[PDB]
């Protein structure tokens, strides 16, 4: 489909930029490029329609241009409201539409984790089985990236991580649990969670001792 | 105010089929087309076709045709969309979006203008069968709490000390693994002076499944 970056990285003030880049049969050959922006589970908004196009409401400070087969949408007046996931939206002939993969926007600068990692009780190595437990709470704004891992290799392997979740003080929570059999416990030195919020990251450690 | 409505949120086996209702109410419904779309949980959005509120003439992407089926009733002014044949990975938000006018200057379906959108209704497949959960502690100011594992359908509640406290409490929202099986966890802030000291215990209930637990954390 639509290739967007996964990440893009601005700091309050203004100036930015995501992309998206599409084939000759869409892009390069329409002007049906929109723009949605998506705050944590909420639905997608129309930040921008027809390439280069603002709706009612949106302000001045997003806008979009294209150069043949590439989308830009650039937020000018960066702001910690603007972190949120941005979609590239295309329309590619023959009656069909298509999505971008998904560009998650954060704002480096000011609300951070309260990371609290938790290893696998005494218990549940003895029901044959193991889980890590990454507990984050109290972030604003609500996007968080969270990475694991044995000694000093990215796991990957099963690791569910939650979406932000609006509490009672407007701040956000996500929670990950890595899932491994004991064996991967007793054997690795350690794990560590990494919940990277906005360009600071905090990082949580844990070993079988 | 043009606003969508849908329904609220159904889990279903894997091999039946879901029904979702689209309410939209501020305009003529018969004149704007009407564009479904979905996401997974953690995953991106997803374009399921569109639907002419007048003629009812629909199209869908190529790997839909077949399970999707959208209908319409102008009456009551709601867009209906059906998924056939559920897979575990159809677990996901389902949006109604509405999309460009209908006229007949220019535009088929086309123009993804998705203006206003709806709240979203969650369908979740998976292997359905009730289950209570297996809780486990979680041991250590200092934080301590339980792991509430594996359990079938949503919700759990959680407590501590029958409800003696609610200082430092934190429910998280559960997470749905690949298993079709949730879990979630309770965690909760006390002072380092206080072990040895208090007895901490929370207590479970996963009425789907009947399960009251009461279980206990020490170091």
């Known amino acids: 489909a639509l290739t967007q970056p996964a990440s893009v990285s601005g700091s309050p003030g203004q100036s930015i930029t995501i992309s998206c880049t599409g084939t000759?049969?869409?892009?390069?050959?329409?002007?049906?490029v929109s723009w949605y922006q998506q705050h944590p589970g909420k639905a997608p908004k129309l930040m921008i329609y027809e390439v280069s196009k603002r709706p009612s409401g949106v302000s001045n400070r997003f806008s979009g241009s294209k150069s043949g087969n590439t989308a830009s949408l650039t937020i000018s007046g960066l702001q910690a409201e603007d972190e949120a996931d941005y979609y590239c939206?295309?329309?590619?002939?023959?009656?069909?539409?298509?999505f971008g993969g998904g560009t998650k926007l954060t704002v480096l600068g000011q609300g951070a984790p309260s990371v609290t990692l938790f290893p696998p009780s005494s218990e549940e190595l003895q029901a044959n089985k193991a889980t890590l437990v990454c507990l984050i709470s109290d972030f604003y704004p609500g996007a968080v990236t969270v990475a694991w891992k044995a000694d000093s290799s990215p796991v990957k392997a099963g690791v569910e991580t939650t979406t932000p979740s609006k509490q009672s003080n407007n701040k956000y929570a996500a929670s990950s649990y890595l899932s491994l059999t004991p064996e991967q416990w007793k054997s690795h030195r350690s794990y560590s969670c990494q919940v990277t919020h906005e360009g600071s990251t905090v990082e949580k450690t844990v070993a079988p001792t | 105010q043009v606003q969508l409505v849908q329904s609220g949120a159904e889990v279903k086996k894997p091999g039946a089929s879901v029904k979702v209702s689209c309410k939209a109410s501020?305009?003529?419904?018969?004149?704007?087309?009407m564009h479904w779309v979905r996401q997974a949980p953690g995953q991106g959005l997803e374009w399921m076709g569109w639907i002419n509120p007048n003629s009812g003439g629909t199209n869908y992407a190529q790997k839909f045709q077949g399970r999707v089926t959208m209908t319409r009733d102008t009456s009551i002014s709601t867009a209906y969309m059906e998924l056939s044949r559920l897979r575990s990975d159809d677990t996901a938000v389902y949006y109604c979006?509405?999309?460009?006018?209908?006229?007949?200057?220019?535009?088929?379906?086309?123009?993804?203008?998705?203006?206003?959108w709806g709240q979203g209704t969650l369908v979740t497949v998976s292997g359905a069968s009730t289950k209570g959960p297996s809780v486990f502690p979680l041991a250590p100011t200092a934080a301590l709490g339980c792991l509430v594992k594996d359990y079938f359908p949503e919700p759990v509640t959680v407590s501590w000390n029958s409800g003696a406290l609610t200082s430092g409490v934190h429910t998280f929202p559960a997470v749905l693994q690949s298993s079709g099986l949730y879990s979630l966890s309770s965690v909760v802030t006390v002072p380092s002076s206080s072990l040895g000291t208090q007895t901490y215990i929370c207590n479970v209930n996963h009425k789907p499944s009947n399960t009251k637990v009461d279980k206990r954390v020490e170091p």
């Open positions: 000759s049969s869409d892009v390069g050959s329409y002007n049906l």
């Open positions: 939206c295309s329309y590619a002939g023959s009656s069909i539409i298509l």
């Open positions: 501020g305009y003529t419904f018969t004149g704007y087309y």
């Open positions: 979006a509405t999309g460009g006018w209908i006229g007949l200057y220019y535009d088929s379906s086309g123009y993804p203008n998705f203006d206003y």
